Symmetry: D2
Subunit: 249 residues, 4 copies
């Protein structure tokens, strides 16, 4: 009957809004989370109140390790066990912090930034395909991949690797009827780790309305890509950045 | 109170699917046409017998010339005259034919039709649409294969590349005015009617997603998204609708 | 003998520096010019003092018109007439000014799309028809995907030039003609453009502790023409000190 | 004295030709190798015969692991130990093999394809910069990165990451006068394994002369980017693919 979606990093911000809107469209949802157990459970409760047994939570650290393949396998399995099926994977979870070229060890930075942003999406993608009729994956990419922030080399590397994943998996999974696409926010919901006037510095850069994307605006692009309106769309990355990537220095 | 859209080359194929779909969505439409007089009127009638006073036609030759600005200005004017408003512009019209570099039209006619229809008319139409002024947006029909061009199509590929520049330049410039500019990029959709079935199946075979061409309705779907309220933060984006064709290596 | 190069808009700045540097490598040069007769001739004198009968000038308006194809064909003719061969085409001439969306528009079109894209397409056609290390180098723009505001016709023309670079590289490859581009960022800024505006640009350039220079451009063209680039076609080299990498 | 350069994977094929041609230009070279011990030693013999004291070898495995930072630090150190300086880093070493999405473990595959192709280049770059004239880094990328081979997702993801590193490190290292650029082969020396019939299928696709690049042709591009003729060039990736990436399906 109803289709089923996995959303990684679904407890807060963008992943939350994606999970909410998938749910409003008639998806059952696996809300993946890492540290945000309260917000994840609270979201599952709200959604289950909307419609019974349509939302489960699943905890997994998506850092790269010897166990990441098992964790990703488990995330996919939990969808099939809760719901009988897995139609949609949304790779949203993301680590994001500076790694200057010139405080964790470098190898922890690699495991986190490359782990969450690229390897976990690869492993989730393999598990999703292996366990397989409007089947699709949506990766959360970055509209500013080709004009990186200074001292974010590892973050930028993982986001570029994700673009490669989207294109590679689109090609290889097409014969199986699995579409693979991305959504590339520019400035959306801003990190809490920064002062509220730096917030205004970015908002001023945005040609369209001089404001950041709501999480819902990102979720709208995701909804379109999983829908029947995108049945011939694969390997495409839709920028949702109000024209920010187009602005020169 | 119903919004209105201009669609160029709207009589047949993809532009028709776009007008039909924008109409089913509640838009009043200007069906622009060049040579397809019968097909244009036929479509405007069928649309008008759904909701009356919703579909007008507008004839224009979108070849580059010293009257092209006036014709583009007139397409836009058609929309305000019939409907009081211009909410959407879909640049769909396009000439497509080989122009070999090492070699029955003069080169300057080729420049005029391939760069005229594919780039200059969209720039002039864009200028008039912006000057004439809400969810305002423009959608340019681009080409997914623009960076892997067919042999001998340099002028056509040039026009489509120009159209990407326009898409990005105008998104940037018109953002302050609340006009979004985005594009939709087909790979293989409806093959040229001149094309033999044997040739058609060569193209079908290339496409990773189902070994078939996009339907026109599938192209139109992406245009509907881009103009909708679900795309209110998207400007300067070009969405490929090519079932993965642009990703296949030689 | 000595190979021969056409360089359009060779009289001043970057096309001059490209012309001198190809000459220093042993090329014979057609210095094309439009309004720059005195500068063009002064260049050819300088190069002819160095080796006689190695530099000719040529006048053409590269604005798009019914006579553009004739003018372009005559540019390639001048190189065969004077030197018995044409080995290298450098598409450097370029018009540059704003065309806000909100001089007639069709003159804007004829200049911005004509000189920047259509003349390069016609010259490319004439070059190819009239044929070994043969190559064309198109002067492209590194900021092509981050355009300046109100520069739509300019930006359209430089995108069209990227499509030409790619389409011509593919189609001419079976003839041993390579087609490539060099994309400056800010090099020598418009001599009419103000002074505080020019220091503002240098300040954003990552490799900016250096002067951007016309010779740095020419170096990249010299590379692409050379036997060190015999396998390179359809490539566009940015020479912009990292400027295209900097976000807003 | 003469400036110096580290070339990774320099024992054979493309890395060898880069090493020869940098030596020809007057560089002192560190020939990094993993398994190819005979080849590496023999190349340093030939270069030292030409000009004594100009060529050392350095063995390291460039697989990602918690010791990869020390190995990368060691390759850099070894150039300072032999020559007192390190002017040029060429990231050439690379694993390359299919990883279908539908006898190595997946974590070894990630370690080799993402380790060698991206993480080791990032650590080498970090070590190179920390230890610090015309300083520059050249990464070996892939002209086919947006038209990947089917079932090469992990490889393609690593090469995509390498593009991000190139751009990210050009921007960040620029104030220190270090330029970072890439050279992107299409078809060059075909894998030793692969059959002669497979070799001609690939040769037939190349618009420019229906042939693969010689290793020397790739090296020429490296030479250009390290020289004084490329001093305003940073963040650029030069395709050396005879037009291959331009060819549609
Ligand atoms: N927000 C923007 O402006 C913007 C701009 C460009 C791109 N994006 C992209 O859009 C996506 C979502 O944006 P966002 O701002 O909502 O992301 P975010 O808040 O920075 O992070 C999203 C979630 O990812 C999960 N995560 C982080 N580290 C993890 C680890 N080691 N293992 C497992 N999960 C982990 C976290 O879950 P828990 O809280 O459960 O620990 C976190 O809440 C990301 O892929 C991001 O890169 C966002
Ligand atoms: N078909 C595909 O597979 C495909 C692939 C890639 C991109 N696209 C793009 O998608 C869009 C729609 O595709 P399509 O195949 O439906 O286009 P098409 O059939 O080739 O042409 C669409 C319409 O353009 C009009 N047109 C042509 N030259 C004109 C001129 N000088 N002045 C005014 N109008 C002119 C024609 O209208 P009249 O009939 O009134 O003369 C024609 O019916 C195009 O922009 C195309 O470049 C299509
Ligand atoms: N300088 C930069 O910052 C920069 C940045 C990005 C890209 N570029 C590209 O690099 C190239 C050369 O740079 P540049 O600044 O030296 O060039 P430029 O000074 O802008 O002009 C190049 C020459 O082209 C000729 N030209 C202009 N309009 C013409 C027309 N309508 N007909 C015929 N010839 C015409 C002119 O020759 P006459 O003097 O004979 O009239 C002109 O001096 C250009 O293609 C440019 O787009 C430059
Ligand atoms: N060949 C092509 O047609 C082509 C096409 C596109 C891109 N490229 C790129 O160009 C560069 C060189 O090409 P190539 O064909 O010469 O590469 P290659 O022969 O496949 O490999 C170069 C060297 O990398 C080293 N290497 C591999 N795995 C390693 C590990 N785990 N640790 C340390 N070193 C390791 C090997 O050294 P040992 O032999 O010492 O074990 C190997 O000889 C590569 O970056 C490649 O991706 C090549
Ligand atoms: C504040 S931002 O627009 O630079 C940005 C950019 C990317 C990003 N990824 C995350 N997981 S949060 C985040 C925030
Ligand atoms: C090569 S194709 O047949 O998919 C193709 C590609 C572009 C194109 N543009 C038109 N106006 S019709 C058309 C057809
Ligand atoms: C914006 S710029 O000043 O770097 C620039 C950009 C492009 C350009 N083209 C010319 N012919 S002059 C010129 C100047
Ligand atoms: C033969 S190929 O052009 O598919 C190819 C492509 C990439 C590659 N990378 C290596 N390290 S060897 C190698 C061979």
């Amino acid at each position: 009957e109803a289709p089923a979606a996995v959303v990684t990093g679904a407890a807060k911000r963008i992943g939350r809004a994606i999970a909410v809107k998938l749910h409003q469209t008639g998806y059952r949802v696996v809300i993946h989370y890492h540290n945000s157990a309260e917000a994840a459970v609270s979201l599952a409760d709200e959604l289950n109140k909307e419609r019974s047994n349509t939302a489960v939570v699943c905890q997994a650290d998506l850092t790269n390790s010897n166990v990441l393949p098992a964790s990703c396998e488990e995330i996919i399995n939990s969808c099939f066990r809760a719901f009988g099926r897995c139609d949609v994977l949304v790779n949203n979870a993301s680590a994001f912090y500076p790694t200057p070229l010139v405080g964790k060890t470098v190898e922890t930075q690699v495991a986190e930034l490359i782990g969450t942003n690229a390897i976990a999406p690869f492993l989730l993608t393999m598990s999703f395909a292996q366990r397989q009729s409007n089947l699709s994956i949506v990766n959360l990419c970055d509209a500013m991949v080709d004009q990186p922030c200074m001292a974010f080399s590892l973050y930028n590397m993982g986001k570029h690797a994700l673009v490669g994943l989207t294109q590679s998996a689109a090609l290889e999974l097409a014969p199986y009827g699995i579409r693979v696409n991305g959504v590339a926010p520019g400035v959306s919901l801003l990190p809490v780790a920064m002062g509220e006037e730096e917030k205004d510095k970015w908002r001023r850069k945005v040609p369209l309305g001089r404001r950041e994307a709501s999480a819902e605006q990102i979720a709208d692009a995701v909804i379109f890509l999983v829908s029947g309106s995108a049945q011939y769309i694969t390997g495409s990355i839709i920028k949702v950045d109000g024209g920010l990537s187009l602005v020169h220095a």
